[PDB]
Design a protein around this ligand. Structure first.
Ligand SMILES: [Fe+3]
Ligand SMILES: [Fe+3]
Ligand SMILES: [Fe+3]
Ligand SMILES: [Fe+3]
Lengths: 491, 83, 322, 491, 322, 83
């Protein structure tokens, strides 16, 4: 017969001991552990809500891959990608490029906790988390690999994070800050609590639904399978926060959460917001990016923070307001500077789409709509060259994304500059600048693409040179997803 | 040659715009307009383009030159429509 | 316009069509792209410094570490297929030997031998788990990291077998202290102090090349020969067929860890000076290993011979690597 | 370490022994064994070409179901069936009804060989075959079950073979004769060699391709998975034939093959022929039923027979000729008598389809086309009631299918009547009558639907009574698949 | 027009939503639709007669045999999931005990005991395979047939384990005759004649009700207690831990066969007269079973006690059914 | 009342058609036509429908009645177009 899991589970995490041949601080360097003065005994109160053992893991995870890989093989000769909406294809090329290698990098982030967390339960769950991200990086490489012969753009599923293309820099900027250069406790909070539990979880749920709605069952199965592995390790931050709040650090925990949530939001406003309100076909939009954020992301954060004894970040109201603006700017920016990304941005401004936008965001046409009005006239009148740029946009020194905001009749574009030690920094928001000011030495000498351009690091020092610097060449450089089809409605 | 960040009125994004230290605020505004007018902003012939320091809102006379404006390299400037 | 490729661009022109293994495991680390600033932040952060000192500045050198290939070609998908089969075998043993009433057939002496020499291993196995997972996060190539990934999974597996059996043993002999006394045995029993000193010290060898040597080349062979090979053979002669089979089953994972370690050493010996670098590290750690083996095995029955076999077998592992 | 399969395989089939407490004839009743005078030693020369052991079976078959069931679950909420071509839906309803329970019945046919074959290797392969058909009956019940709430027609996946509906009788007539009422050796020849190796194998290959072409990946995966189990047991007839030919029975083996192939052809001409040339959308037809038969079925039979030392059946030339006629008649019959089947027959006679037919079968329009001309005029002129019948068609007493053939300008409809012991029998072909004459006592008192009608066994003795006798009611009674859409092209 | 149903029509209105088991296993046989003419052919064919005499005319009666339900609810899908796990356990034992050199540790006496009492079982196991597969093709309900289907698969499984081990044993002891002498032992060794007479006679009991009783209720318990229980316990005391574990693993299949057999008997006892029908069949066959057990076990070491335990345990199987 | 199988000219299938033993071959042909003419066969007004025994091809006079034709119940008859 077999024992009940509940009978022996605890022995799997009764692994702490008192070092003798080396000191505790040597075995658990503070810069890697982040125990923050809290004793080993106090950290042993850590209790992961979702428990699992090795044999259950290899068994359940074997079946998950068997199914996901079986579905792929079955739908492979079908070539759905060949007839899929260009907006959907772009969504996937973007997804794989910005995420595949960052997924793999997350296993190192997990390994950080696996070795340096003083909480035994955290160390084991992180070992399974490490395995989870190992799977995510491999499966999200194996799937797009099937499309390499279709377009060089699919090569960016692997190549992207190895380039200095602006979007890739913004990605590494976020991920390196949240999970690769933080102590164990900090990682569990900033990565698994703030980012995975707070954004990634719901996002993959909606992405898998979108895939299905688009008729892409291979991708839908892929994403929903991956998403079921999430809670097993996204759960790690919760108990760490409980321990920090119950001991002396409530403020320290709050600050990490504030930073992580804001930085997550920014990457989300450019990689997800534009997709929901502009790339997804009008008739497939079940709700707006803002509606999605309010129902599935924002409300959850408030319940989570409340249940943890933490407060809503100082920037919460502003964040709410920005749900009406930020992503519209990130979209216009990406589309206008489309040759600089590796996928084809979908304009999404046809007459029908424009009334939807007006419905979801009252005032859109008299603000964002005006820039698009000018762009549309030029396309209608044969001046396409006025729809691409001849200069670089100003880049935020924190999120590494263009500084953009409400245009038109309610012009409200602002730059939160900061002079620090003889250098002028630019920030796209009050919160981005604050992330810099609470920890200047963490970002001080990093240079964004604009900084590099101005320092002479990009040669030739022109647009063609900047494109080469970013490893972009005809074939992968972006253009309008539907090849300006939406222009015909304006003649 | 001097770099400044252009925050053009009614546009949605701030942009890098190289001006000359000898440029007049008028000539600065002209260089900035190139990147916004007829790209994302409609011309306004009945108005005059003025240069304002973004951080404090200091309005620079039309005839003042970059060299005398006391700007930090990369300083952000608002390019607004005035009478 | 750039023409579509037949494979990933970094694998293009290989004559031999890339395997699933190469497709999902090669050239994935990006921190090695900018040695002067591995992470996309300020170059002076502590983590920047940690990787520059412990990864980039390691004396174990090679121009193309991403060229490393796991001889077993393990991928997450095949790892779980492989291990789910092995766990079915192992859970089957647990389940059916229990039905047979196997633990009630053990003598009291042996039961006490288990409490001393077997169950406290949960600490040493978890320490190896920590040791191999550190190698994962500091190694210079994704293919090297992946081997360490699965190896770490295996260590958690051994810990888990041990945790499970400790429970079963405690249920069968409530008065022995199974599950309750292991920390004190590990921390205070002289039979364990050799291994404890060895792993505690190795756990702070941050240089990736040294971590690999201290953990995979010196410590593991010593732990595997003492706790799996020696204790297992003894277990079977003492009537404990379950532990004899369990140890043999875990040794299958050990053999795989040795195969990739042997492969990495082979690759390293492609560059002049590395053989000497690895030998210096082994010379520094070997003494703690001998000490570990001597303290553990000498306390076992016919202990002095167990020491000679364990020392001989673990050294043979490194000998065969050059 | 493990042994090589080749090292111990033979011991798995070294299971024959000399009975002592019972006689050999008692242990292996001739009526069940069919050893036919050939000794046990001579039957032990039986050597299955495709070998497999228990552990390989449970392992490989576990993965096959894991994948097929995973694909189904993944595409379930998609509801492809709801938007699939009606011709395809009909193809599936027909498939499940005529096959699901016959698949399950085949496991008993396999069990017949498993117990009574004197060849050890045949007994073991039949045990795996028994398992295979057990899977086929269950999986082809489980899949259509997903559609029961969509239409009562899906209930016939289980109900059909339990009714006296004419198609169900024709099915049981075939299957009971080939595999349920024959001795072990006869079964291996008539079922696995003639039917499975000769027709079923290729047919499932084409069916799975059709499913994919139709966009039904659930069904495509289902069918191709099932088809891979086929060769493992369809192989059983080959070695039996070798043994019969090498001993004294070559004529006996030939006769069983002649009967089985002809009876298979007839069921095939009504269940598969009509589907390929009329239900499958014009643009999805990769080849005609005749082309399919010549390339994938007929040529293979000739090679198989030649390699076995057997001859081409006496009816071979006629069979070739009939590829131009038979199924067209079976189709017209099923469509004209559509209220009598449980799926919606697709007419398939639109202008475009008619030129395709003329292309694949020169002379179609001046023969089959004329009946359809009359039917079309009546539909165009509002006389739909002249497109359904008021009497029963004459039924062949062997294949239990209507006796039909070339109409129009080359009228060639014939009835191969036979008076036997004071009763007049009707046969749809020279070969069907011959199957009766070489073994009269096997069919003598069986009565087809027409016979039952005329004997007073169907009451009330009218069409409404015949429908009730066949368990058919509004809701499942068939009509035009596209609801007479094709009529609009004629106005 | 007929409205779509929530389930199959024959399962409609069950209050309790049908399980996958009920959906894919119930009311599938169609030959029971027309008792006077089961098959769609002439009613006088030999097969028509065979089913009317051996299925329909059986004295074991019930009005609704299709109501039978396998207590284990085995379906093809779950059967392979269950057995693939058990085979992983068993192939693991084979593989690793071989690595351990298990067969070379057996004494010569025991090896000769295996040649006599163990390897010839390939004949008896295949005979059970034939016995259970006949039950499959003559039973009155698809749910009954399915139990017999999987049971037959299990018998082939035992035959296969035996065939594999016979090879391994022959490779380890080339001069014993393993694989070569089993037919003569089965046909001529007195220790086997009891079982041989029993199964040869039972193999021609064509009535489905009697076949079930002779094969599942009388013969199997006798074979399982002698060859698995008794030989297995002996094997372990003789140092053959592989056979002791193998026999225990196969006994898991036996227990499952007993569970469904017990369920069928329970159902049968719903109708008056069936208890007496089943007891008469058992009374007729029991004597051959005792004879089988006596001849096999008496030839074993401490044989007379093995006979008392085997007789007692096999009878207990039927006793617990009523 | 007597059953016969109708093999109507130019049609594609033989059908069951109940006739009366007192029916004339003409009346038999009329009963058979009901099931083929204007259903699958075009009328031919310039022709006359004749009844022929299928097995041997015996042509029955238009005026002969079923009762005198010497038919086996269920006998198949060809219904052909003649002058
Ligand atoms: Fe992930
Ligand atoms: Fe994650
Ligand atoms: Fe089948
Ligand atoms: Fe089959």
């Amino acid at each position: 017969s077999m024992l009940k899991r509940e009978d022996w589970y605890d022995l799997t995490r009764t692994t702490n001991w008192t070092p003798k041949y080396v000191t505790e601080n040597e075995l658990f360097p503070e810069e890697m552990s982040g125990a923050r003065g809290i004793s080993m005994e106090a950290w042993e109160k850590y209790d992961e809500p979702y428990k699992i053992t090795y044999p259950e893991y290899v068994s359940i995870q074997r079946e998950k891959d068997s199914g996901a890989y079986s579905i792929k093989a079955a739908l492979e000769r079908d070539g759905f990608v060949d007839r899929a909406d260009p907006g959907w294809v772009s969504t996937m090329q973007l997804h794989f490029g910005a995420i595949a290698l960052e997924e793999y990098a997350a296993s190192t982030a997990e390994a950080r906790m696996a070795r340096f967390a003083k909480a035994p339960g955290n160390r084991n769950m992180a070992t399974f988390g490490m395995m989870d991200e190992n799977r995510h990086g491999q499966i999200q490489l194996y799937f797009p690999y099937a499309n390499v012969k279709r377009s060089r753009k699919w090569d960016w599923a692997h190549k992207a994070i190895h380039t200095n293309e602006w979007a890739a820099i913004a990605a590494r900027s976020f991920f390196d800050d949240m999970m690769m250069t933080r102590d164990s406790v900090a990682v569990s909070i900033m990565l698994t609590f703030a980012f995975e539990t707070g954004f990634g979880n719901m996002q993959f749920l909606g992405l898998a639904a979108d895939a299905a709605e688009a008729g892409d069952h291979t991708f839908a199965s892929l994403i929903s399978s991956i998403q079921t592995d999430e809670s097993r390790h996204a759960q790690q931050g919760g108990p760490s926060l409980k321990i920090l709040v119950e001991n002396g650090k409530k403020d320290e925990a709050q600050q990490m959460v504030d930073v992580a949530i804001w930085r997550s939001w920014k990457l989300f406003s450019v990689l997800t917001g534009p997709i929901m309100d502009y790339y997804t076909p009008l008739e497939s939009r079940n709700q707006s990016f803002k509606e999605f954020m309010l129902e599935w992301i924002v409300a959850q954060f408030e319940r989570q923070l409340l249940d943890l004894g933490l407060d809503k970040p100082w920037y919460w109201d502003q964040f709410m307001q920005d749900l009406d603006e930020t992503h519209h700017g990130m979209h216009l920016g990406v589309w206008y500077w489309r040759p600089t990304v590796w996928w084809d941005p979908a304009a999404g401004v046809s007459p029908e789409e424009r009334e939807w936008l007006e419905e979801k965001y009252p005032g859109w046409n008299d603000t964002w709509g005006q820039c698009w009005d000018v762009i549309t006239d030029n396309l209608v009148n044969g001046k396409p060259e006025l729809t691409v740029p001849e200069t670089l946009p100003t880049i935020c020194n924190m999120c590494n994304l263009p500084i953009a905001h409400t245009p038109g009749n309610k012009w409200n574009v602002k730059d939160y500059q900061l002079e620090y030690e003889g250098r002028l920094y630019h920030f796209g928001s009050e919160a981005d600048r604050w992330c810099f000011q609470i920890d200047p030495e963490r970002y001080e000498n990093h240079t964004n693409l604009v900084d590099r351009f101005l320092k002479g690091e990009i040669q030739p020092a022109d647009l063609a040179g900047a494109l080469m610097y970013m490893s972009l060449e005809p074939g992968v450089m972006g253009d309008d997803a539907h090849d300006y089809e939406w222009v015909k409605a304006y003649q | 040659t001097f770099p400044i960040m252009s925050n053009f009125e009614r546009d949605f994004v701030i942009q890098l715009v190289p001006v000359d230290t000898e440029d007049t605020m008028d000539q600065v505004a002209e260089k900035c307009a190139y990147h916004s007018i007829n790209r994302r902003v409609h011309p306004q012939p009945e108005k005059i383009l003025r240069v304002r320091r973004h951080e404090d809102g200091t309005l620079f006379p039309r005839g003042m030159i970059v060299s005398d404006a006391g700007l930090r390299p990369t300083e952000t400037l608002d390019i607004i429509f005035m009478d | 316009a750039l023409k579509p490729l037949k494979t990933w661009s970094h694998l293009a022109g290989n004559r031999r069509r890339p395997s699933e293994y190469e497709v999902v495991s090669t050239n994935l680390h990006y921190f090695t792209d900018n040695p002067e600033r591995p992470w996309e932040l300020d170059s002076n952060l502590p983590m920047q410094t940690w990787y520059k000192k412990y990864c980039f500045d390691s004396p174990l050198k090679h121009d193309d570490w991403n060229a490393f290939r796991d001889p077993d070609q393990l991928v997450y998908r095949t790892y779980n297929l492989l291990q789910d089969g092995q766990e079915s075998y192992v859970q089957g043993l647990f389940d059916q030997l229990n039905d047979r009433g196997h633990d009630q057939m053990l003598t009291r002496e042996w039961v006490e031998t288990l409490a001393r020499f077997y169950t406290p291993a949960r600490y040493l196995f978890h320490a190896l788990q920590m040791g191999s997972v550190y190698i994962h996060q500091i190694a210079p190539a994704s293919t090297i990291t992946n081997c360490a990934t699965y190896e770490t999974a295996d260590h958690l597996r051994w810990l888990t077998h041990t945790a499970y059996r400790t429970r079963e043993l405690a249920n069968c002999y409530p008065d022995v202290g199974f599950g309750k006394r292991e920390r004190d045995v590990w921390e205070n029993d002289p039979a364990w102090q050799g291994f404890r000193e060895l792993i505690e010290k190795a756990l702070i060898a941050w240089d990736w090349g040294e971590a690999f040597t201290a953990i995979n080349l010196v410590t593991k062979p010593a732990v595997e020969e003492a706790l799996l090979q020696q204790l297992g053979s003894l277990a079977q002669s003492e009537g404990d067929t379950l532990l004899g089979l369990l140890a043999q089953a875990q040794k299958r994972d050990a053999e795989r860890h040795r195969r990739w370690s042997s492969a990495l050493v082979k690759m390293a010996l492609e560059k002049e000076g590395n053989r000497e670098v690895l030998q210096k590290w082994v010379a520094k750690w070997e003494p703690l290993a001998d000490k570990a083996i001597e303290a553990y095995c000498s306390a076992l029955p016919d202990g002095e011979n167990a020491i000679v076999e364990a020392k001989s077998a673990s050294r043979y592992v490194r000998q065969m690597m050059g």
